[PDB]
Design a protein around this ligand. Structure first.
Ligand SMILES: CCCCCCCCCCCCCCCC(=O)O
Lengths: 267, 54, 252, 237, 237, 60, 54, 54
């Protein structure tokens, strides 16, 4: 993807006006710097390969982290899948209005020892289970539940001390693209929920320890990473100026357009 | 087995192992440009050397 | 001479003697739905002369301390002729638009306007917990206006209408990434934008979803001297293009 | 049992890797593709679009639409300066927040030319001529119109065509430049002066305004993608 | 010793993987195959078979065979409603438990048309005409026969052929719909009214009954297999 | 338009077939057959009333 | 080595390593339909436009 | 697959797996010599058997 090269030029005295235009037409001028001054011939070998949509968006970014305790009544974690609780991936995806990609999912699981009271605490290797429930299915209510039978829901098992678990997800949607912005309601009477919460229905993700609480409590933490593959994008958008405040909507507090200086001629 | 060109400033080999097309690697080498739909979205074409309004 | 146009749609005509070029969307002209993209499987209705014509909204006054105006686009035409009657009896629909904003003044006045068209312009609220209710987000062919101040948090369901944030939390100078034109009273008299159908689905309901927003923001304010005409109106004219509908039912 | 041997770099999670992974939902039928208008293939198509530049910060115009307007009067002398700022498209607070200056804050290196478009939003009976100059580094900032005419300039005559373009050329010792502020890779200064006066008739207001735009040429490119410093977080939303 | 390098996703148990594994009983002779009648290749062949619909729940007919019967009388007025229910084939408790509504509760997305067959199980001397309507969403439920005739309807004349089919077409803005209840992807309402009366001779009973069936067309499809909410367990059996 | 050469203006010239009354607003008059006249260098505009009738001839 | 077609909305390679046919992978790509043995199990064929009983 | 010559005092095989040319192995077999630009950087050539200054 090489860039255009420079063409040599000569002194002119003519009727053609490249520098004069009209910006009132909504049309950006197509002048090169070899029209306003004398240039030399320069062969450019630079490429635009690092600014593609396939290269700008295909990196792993953290979206959530949750904790769950071993020695606890109903100690397990849940998360409703969205991309609006972090500030860095939300600003990158909201440069466009419609997106369409595959996904790559990676989990990072740690553990920590809690202040127990017994002597000679020695625990074996821990095993974790991460379950995905599509919308409409049965959900777990506790740790020893029948809902963890995973007969048709996809799940994964992992033992501590190995490579992190990874899997792929295709373009799961009902429409033809994902929508970052929705200007409308969910009811036909125009009441209630207004915004992007009317389109978010992706499921819930559950996490638990498979072992038993032997002689000491253990507190674990999972971290989730998103990586879009095979990306298409439509209708670009200005970047966000103000800071994000909530998750469901786009409410903000107003702020200035830039920072200030002391004069108009200050360099 | 696909043999591609391996971006420099030499080839490599690629085989697919899974049955679904969502399991492949990233594209990373689709360089295509069309800046005219954003910078010149007008009806009548405008020559650079001519004036804008006659 | 590029300075004259003539647009003919149905039984209506616009004539202009002082104009810039015509901006066409993202390079795409409006067209009917094809057989490869269709999902609703019954036959659509195409009236095509009774709906595809120029409808004129109300007029607003450009004052000196004026901040801006906006319109939600498949909502101002909800009581206009036979276009607003097909929306009530049907469930689906898709439309392209042709917008013509027009404002005239003499050679002794000055000022500049930006006329953009924003797809999916979701707006925010002044109270940080709620969302704005329907009466503030849009009106029936009547402009909702921005203001140069900041709306306080003591109100519950009101839109945050600071102009430099454009209601959406972004910079107002970066709104030129959308298809737009300018009206400069030194040289220009009108602006014309042709927009195709933009959505993530091939058809949609036109009463729960506004998919376009037309904003008019004065960057350079209106100025004149003593003796010149103080009343300057702005008028907007919208024409649907290649409209079709599906799903007949009761009148809603 | 084929004999193999594992190298360093095993069981690691590099966040920019390029591998295959097994699918969690096998044999899935995705929705067919539709022709939506306005497809973006490269981020440089976004950066080549004009954007209004806030040259008029001045400590109280930032929470207003007055930051984008450049004041222009009728003077009683000659050779006054209109504005001036250093050319730093990602570190200077004038060009920081524009459409070009936001894409550059995701990268580290940049290279190419820069367009600057000026529009005269005054009355149709007012005249004037201006000087739009660019000065490479090595010396200071020009303090006169005599010092600013020695660089790269264009003389703009305001008539029926209301816009003019000053195309800042690529003059550098290297191939790329740093986005962050760096005295080894400075780029210079952009100024504006009065050539003649703003002559106006009777019953016309003397004070006019000028808008400014910025974009990139077709040799612009970027490199070394990083994070942006323009966002914060404390807790999850 | 070939040099290799192990990636993330090693030593994990994904329950929907597709790999080879060594056999625990090598060189086993399986019993040869036999031609048994009735082989199922796709689950959609099961869903395209008619099934009786319990339209008559009404708080005490569920533990009876009376849930499947629709009461029909001879009236003294005109334009009365027979039944009515919303079209939700996996969330509404009318179509929940049928042969089509049990396959849909294993999946998440569905798309296609739906057939509805009505049979008149009355006397051979009784007559009548009915109206079977379908109303897309956007408005409410039709409360008259004047409002229900504006949608998609068929007029059924009861004669020698005792059945009629109302084929609900696919009218949607998207390609797929959610199985669980969702106001963004609603499907509408199905009603039934009296066109004329049920005229009966002497020494014939006036009260008749109607049965209802449901199935799928040949463009029906499903997606995103999940678990069903229709079973429990506490301990092992 | 026989005015001064510095004055501007835009007008609406409409025609309404019978069946209803006379339009009392610009909202009612834009639903018929109209043209929008922009006054500039060309000082004239033509509104061509078409033949809309149920018969072939009309009474004088 | 078998080269198959890799379901999309591109190919892949598959080699068998074990001696028993019960050690292979799943089929997953055998799309065959015969709905007529359940929906129309009648003796005389019935045309749609004709009446059922004459 | 490249087949090279395997330095002795016999061949080997090499395949590239990644898409970038900075991911390859080291060169290690580029033997090239030009000592004359450091040892004889003079304008007029000097024959060994002739005297240096005439
Ligand atoms: C163990 C398997 C886990 C399966 C995880 C599947 C997660 C589904 C991913 C949904 C992508 C969300 C994209 C953003 C949605 C939107 O912007 O509207």
């Amino acid at each position: 993807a090489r860039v255009a090269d420079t063409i040599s030029s000569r002194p002119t005295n003519s009727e053609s006006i490249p520098a004069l235009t009209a910006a009132e037409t909504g049309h950006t001028s197509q002048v090169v710097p070899s029209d306003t001054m004398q240039t030399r011939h320069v062969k450019n070998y630079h490429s635009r390969s690092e600014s593609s949509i396939e290269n700008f968006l295909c990196r792993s970014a953290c979206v959530y982290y949750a904790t769950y305790t071993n020695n606890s009544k109903k100690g397990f974690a849940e998360w409703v899948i969205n991309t609006r609780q972090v500030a860095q991936l939300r600003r990158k995806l909201e440069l466009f209005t419609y997106l369409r990609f595959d996904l790559e999912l990676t989990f990072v699981i740690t553990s920590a020892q809690q202040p127990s009271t017994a002597s000679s605490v020695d625990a074996p290797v821990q095993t974790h289970q991460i379950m995905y429930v599509p919308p409409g299915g049965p959900v777990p209510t506790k740790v020893k539940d029948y809902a963890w039978q995973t007969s048709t829901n996809p799940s994964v098992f992992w033992t501590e001390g190995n490579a992190p678990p990874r899997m792929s997800i295709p373009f799961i949607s009902i429409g033809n693209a994902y929508s970052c912005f929705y200007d409308g309601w969910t009811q036909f009477s125009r009441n209630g929920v207004y915004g992007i919460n009317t389109l978010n229905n992706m499921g819930t993700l559950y996490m638990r320890h498979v072992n038993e609480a032997g002689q000491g409590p253990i507190k674990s933490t999972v971290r989730i990473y998103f990586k879009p593959k095979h990306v298409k994008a439509w209708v670009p958008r200005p970047p966000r100026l103000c800071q994000y405040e909530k998750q469901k909507n786009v409410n903000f507090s107003p702020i200035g357009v830039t920072t200030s200086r002391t004069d108009i001629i200050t360099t | 087995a696909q043999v591609s060109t391996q971006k420099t400033g030499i080839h490599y080999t690629n085989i697919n192992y899974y049955k679904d097309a969502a399991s492949n690697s990233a594209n990373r080498q689709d360089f295509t440009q069309d800046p005219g739909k954003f910078t010149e979205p007008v009806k009548d074409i405008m020559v650079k050397t001519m004036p804008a309004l006659n | 001479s590029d300075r004259v146009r003539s647009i003919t749609l149905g039984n209506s005509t616009i004539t202009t003697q002082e104009c810039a070029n015509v901006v066409v969307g993202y390079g795409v002209w409006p067209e009917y739905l094809k057989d490869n993209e269709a999902t609703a499987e019954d036959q659509p209705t195409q009236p095509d002369v009774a709906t595809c014509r120029f409808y004129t909204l109300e007029s607003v006054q450009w004052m000196k301390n004026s901040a801006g105006w906006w319109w939600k686009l498949p909502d101002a035409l909800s009581q206009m002729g036979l276009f607003g009657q097909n929306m009530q009896y049907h469930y689906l629909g898709r439309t392209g638009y042709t917008i013509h904003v027009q404002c005239n003044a003499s050679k002794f006045h000055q000022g500049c306007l930006l006329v953009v068209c924003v797809p999916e312009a979701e707006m925010g609220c002044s109270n940080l917990n709620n969302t704005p209710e329907f009466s503030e987000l849009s009106g029936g062919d009547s402009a909702r206006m921005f203001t140069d101040t900041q709306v306080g948090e003591s109100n519950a369901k009101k839109v945050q209408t600071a102009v430099w944030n454009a209601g959406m939390g972004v910079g107002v100078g970066n709104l030129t990434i959308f298809p737009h034109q300018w009206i400069n009273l030194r040289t220009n008299n009108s602006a014309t934008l042709v927009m195709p159908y933009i959505n993530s689905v091939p058809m949609d309901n036109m009463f729960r979803h506004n998919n376009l927003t037309l904003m008019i923001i004065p960057f350079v304010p209106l100025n004149y001297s003593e003796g010149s005409s103080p009343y300057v109106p702005i008028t907007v004219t919208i024409a649907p293009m290649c409209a079709e509908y599906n799903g007949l039912r009761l009148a809603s | 049992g084929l004999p193999v041997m594992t190298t360093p770099g095993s069981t690691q999670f590099l966040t920019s890797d390029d591998f295959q992974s097994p699918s969690a939902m096998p044999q899935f039928d995705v929705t067919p593709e539709m022709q939506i208008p306005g497809r973006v293939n490269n981020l440089m198509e976004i950066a080549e679009v004009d954007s209004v530049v806030p040259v008029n910060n001045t400590e109280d115009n930032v929470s207003s639409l007055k930051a984008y307007q450049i004041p222009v009067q009728s003077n009683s002398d000659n050779g006054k300066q209109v504005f001036g700022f250093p050319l730093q498209p990602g570190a200077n607070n004038v060009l920081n927040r524009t459409l070009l200056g936001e894409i550059l804050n995701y990268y580290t290196h940049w290279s190419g030319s820069i367009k600057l478009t000026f529009m005269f939003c005054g009355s149709a009976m007012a005249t004037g001529k201006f000087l739009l100059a660019y000065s490479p580094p090595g010396a200071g900032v020009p303090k006169n119109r005599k010092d600013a005419m020695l660089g790269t300039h264009v003389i703009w005559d305001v008539g029926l065509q209301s816009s003019c373009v000053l195309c800042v050329p690529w003059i550098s010792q290297t191939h790329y430049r740093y986005v962050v502020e760096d005295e080894y890779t400075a780029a210079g200064y952009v100024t504006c002066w009065y050539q003649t006066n703003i002559v106006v008739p009777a019953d016309v207001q003397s004070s006019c305004d000028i808008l400014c735009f910025v974009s990139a040429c077709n040799d612009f490119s970027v490199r070394m993608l990083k994070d942006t410093p323009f966002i914060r977080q404390d807790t999850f939303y």
